[PDB]
Design a protein around this ligand. Sequence first.
Ligand SMILES: [Zn+2]
Lengths: 140, 129, 81, 44, 150
Amino acid sequence: GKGKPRGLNSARKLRVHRRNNRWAENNYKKRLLGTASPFGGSSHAKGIVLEKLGIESKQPNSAIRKCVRVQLIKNGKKVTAFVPNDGCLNFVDENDEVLLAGFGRKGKAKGDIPGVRFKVVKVSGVSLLALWKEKKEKPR
Amino acid sequence: TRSSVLADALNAINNAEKTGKRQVLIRPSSKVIIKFLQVMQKHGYIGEFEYIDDHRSGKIVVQLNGRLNKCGVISPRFNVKIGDIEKWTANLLPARQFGYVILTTSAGIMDHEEARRKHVSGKILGFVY
Amino acid sequence: VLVQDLLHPTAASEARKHKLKTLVQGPRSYFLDVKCPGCLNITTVFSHAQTAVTCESCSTILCTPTGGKAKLSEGTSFRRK
Amino acid sequence: AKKKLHTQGHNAKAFAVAAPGKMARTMQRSSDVNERKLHVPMVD
Amino acid sequence: GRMHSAGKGISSSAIPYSRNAPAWFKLSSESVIEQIVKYARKGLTPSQIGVLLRDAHGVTQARVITGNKIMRILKSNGLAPEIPEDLYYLIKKAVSVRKHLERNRKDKDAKFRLILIESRIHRLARYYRTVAVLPPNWKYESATASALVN
RNA sequence: CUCCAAUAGCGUAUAUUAUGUUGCAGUUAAAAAGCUCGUAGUUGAACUUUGGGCCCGGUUGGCCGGUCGGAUUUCCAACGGGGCCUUUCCUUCUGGCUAACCUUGAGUCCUUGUGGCUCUUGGCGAACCAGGACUUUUACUUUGAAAAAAUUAGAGUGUUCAAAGCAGGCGUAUUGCUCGAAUAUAUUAGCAUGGAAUAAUAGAAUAGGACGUUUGGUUCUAUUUUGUUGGUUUCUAGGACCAUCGUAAUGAUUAAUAGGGACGGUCGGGGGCAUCAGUAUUCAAUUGUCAGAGGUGAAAUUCUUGGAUUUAUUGAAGACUAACUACUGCGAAAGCAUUUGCCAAGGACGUUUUCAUUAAUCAAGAACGAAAGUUAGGGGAUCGAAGAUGAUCAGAUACCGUCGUAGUCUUAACCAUAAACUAUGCCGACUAGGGAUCGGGUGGUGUUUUUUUAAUGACCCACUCGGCACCUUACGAGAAAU
Ligand SMILES: [Zn+2]
C-alpha cells in the first residue's frame, strides 16, 4: 500500500502522524509557536522626517527627488520613502510626524529606485492627498 | 504472510487482462472471492469460472473476455454510511453511468446499485469497471 | 500459450512437473510388497524407508536408506501396491 | 524543524499559543495603538 | 518462510487426496492402535512411531487407518510426556549447545545460535501455555533445563 | 489639457484566504536503523444451512380507462417485504387470546366454477399479555426517538425594490370574514427495533460433556392450608450436587505450493577450540671469494680487514597462507582460503512422518559489529601515524630515500561507529523466453572404468526443487541509463 496504515482501527496512528507532520507547515508552526508585516505589526508606521533626500536633483518630479529619509519612532531604524507627486515635497519640512505606508508598486517604471519600500501618507495628522488637493491645511 | 486473499485474486485478474490473457488460475479462493467473482460476472466483466477442489482452500480458473479495465480491492474495509456511498463511487468510478462499487452489507455482498435499491449499506469491498 | 487448457493438462507435461506444482497435489512415492525366498511371507516397504527395515522374523536387512528411494537389499524382489 | 527548536536551552516546541488567530489578530491591533502613542520628545 | 534464517526452502510431504482406503491395506484400527502403543511403550516419540509405522508396516497415515492422530492416541492410553515432543527436542538441543558454550567460551557462533534456539523455545512455550497444555507461568530456565530433558 | 475603471463610495498600508485517511515521497542530487532477535502495537489461510418447492400482501411502470386532470380490476413484465415445507428452537414450561385454516356447518350473490365473504359445535400458536424457571460474549449495519432556540438551506407573502420582517389577504371598509407563522440538516456516546454477510468471542478430550421416562443417596429454598399471631415437623412444590441404569451416528474440520518439529543422504572459504605444513622476510653462528655494495629521475644520508653485497650449510623468532582463485562457495552481517582432530550449529532438497494457526511485521529492550583507537598482561619477525634525518640539481614528464616510537599479532576487558552500499525494509502472491553452473533428489535394456559379468565411481541425456549469476526480450516500467 506504500506506507500509510489502511486498517479500520488505525485512526489514532493516522491522526498522530498528521499532527507530527503539520509542523513542516511554515504557516501552521508560526501559528502555534505564537511567533507573531514589514516593519512592525501594523499596516502603517509613524516616523520623524530626518532630512529630505534628492533636493539637489535637477530633473523635477524624478525618482531621486521624491525621497525623504524618515526614521521610525518605534525602532529608530531610518528608512527612505517616496512622497508622491514632487510638488508634495513643499509640505514636508523636517521633524514633521509622518505616517509611512507600503509603496508596493506592481511593475517597475523606467527610472524607479528599488529599495524605496515606503510611501508617505499623512503628515502632522493630515493627508498629503488632502493637502495636495487643497482640502486641509498643515497644522503646526 | 497473505493478508488479503481477495487482493491476490483481483490483482491476478487485473494482470491477466493487462497482458491480454483469456484466463487466470487464482489461489486460494474463498467464499468472498466467489461472491466478488459472481458480481463481476453478473455484469459481464468476466466469463465463466471454475472452482477446482484441492483438498484445501480452493483454486479458481476465471475465463475473462476483455471488457475489463480494472477490478480493485479497498484495503481496509471501511464502513460506509449509505449516504457516503455517493462519495465512494465518485472518488473511484470513471463516470456516473457505468461501473460498480461492490461492498459487503448485512444483506449480502452486493454492488452499490443493488445496495441502493435494497436500501442497505455496510462496509466497502472493492470495485469494477 | 495465450490460450490453453489449464483444466485438462496433458498427462506427460503433468508427469514431469514437481509434486506440489501438479494441478492437485499428490505424492510420487509408492509402496511395495517385498520378499526373500528364505522366508514365506511378504513385508511391505515404503519406497523411501529412512529406517533400515528389518524383515518379519529373520534379522536380515531389506533396504538401506538413501537421499530418496531406499536401496533394496541386493538379492530380493518386489511388486508395487 | 526538529533540531532547530532544540538548539535553545528551553524546549522551543513546549511554549506555544492555544490560538494562532487571536494572538496574531490582537498583536497587530495592539501595536497600532502603541505606535500611535509615540510622539517626538520635548521639554516642558 | 523459515523463521530464523534466510532459507526459502519449500519442501514437505505432499499428502494424498484419499482420506480413507488404501484398499490394498487390510489389517484394522484395532491392530495398529495396539502397534502405536507398544512402540510408544518402548519410549518412542509419536514422530518416530509414524516413521516406524510407515516403513516396516504399511501405515500410510496413522490418522487414516485409525480415526486419530498419533499423539492423541498416546494421551488416551496414558502415555503422553510432561511436555510436547517439539519443545523437548528444542530444550534438549539448547542444553547440548550450552554445555558446549561452557566448554568453549570463545565460540561466538554458538552464542548466537543458542540465542536463536532459546528464542524459539520461549515463543513455543508461550504458545503451549496459551492453550493450557502447559501450566500458566511454565518457563524454560537454563539453570533447570538440564534436569527437564535428561 | 485629453481619455479609462468603480460610482455615494473608491485608494493606500498590514497580515492572511483563494502533512498525503481519501492521497505524497524515500535507486542515481531530500529520506530504509550496520545487522538479527523481540515485547507493546497493528495485521493474520480455508471449512460449519446451502440448494430446491409452495403460498401471502405491497410500489413503481406499461398497455388498455370504466370515467366525469386521476380512478381500479384483470393481461403483463421489473423491483422489493413477509411467512411456510424441505432432518431445521421459536428460551422454556404453567394459562390467559385466540388472528389465522388442515377445518365445515348449511349453501351459494353469480360468468358451464374453488372466481367470493358473512357464517358456529371436533381440529394452528406464539401475535403478546404475566407468573415461574435460564439465558456465551462483542463489533458492524438498519429503522426509530432524540437533539433549544438563533444562524444555515428552503416554502409562502408585491417591506414601492431590496437587505429584512413574519407578516398578511378578502368584504357589507356601519359593529367582520379569513390563509399563515412549514419542512430539511444534526454523526460520537447512551437508548429502542430489524438484519445475521464480513471480523472477532465462548463450546466436549484426564469427559468434572449432553439430553430423561427412569430411580437411589445429599442438600437448599417456603407459599398455600390446618381460626389468629409466634415456635417447632409433617405433607407438598421448585433449584442445586455426588452416584447409578437409560437415550445417542455419542463428542476432535481441512492437513495451507502457512509456520514449527522428527527423520535420510548430502553441500558449504558458516563458527569455536586444539593441531600440521609451506616457501618467504629479518637476524645469528659457520663459510667461500674480492672491492665495492645500497638506493633513486639523478643523488646523498648509509655498509664496507668488521671481508660488505653475493655464496654455502645450518639454526632461531613472529607473521602470513602465494600459485591453484572462480566475485564462485558459505555466513545474520562484520567476515571466512595449509591440514587434520574434536565441539556444537545451518540452509536447500527428499519426505503417503509429526504438531495444527503455533504466524507476519515490529516502538521499548537486547545479541553480534571491519580498520583505527583505549585499559591490563604477553608478543614485539615484518611493515610502520609520531619523531629525527638525506640531499634539494634546470625539471619534477620518473616528490621519494633512511633511522624508526606507538602500532601491527595474542589474552582479558573497552569503544560501538564506515560510501557498515546492490550508493535499492520485511513476508507472501501474480506476470516471459533461453542456454550455462552450484547443491539435492527421481527417471535410463546412456557412455566409460574389467574381472566373469556386476556393485561402486566419474561422466551423458531428460525432469524437478532450492542457490550464485548471465543472455534475449516484452503483451510491462522509466527522464533515460536501464
Ligand atoms: Zn530380507
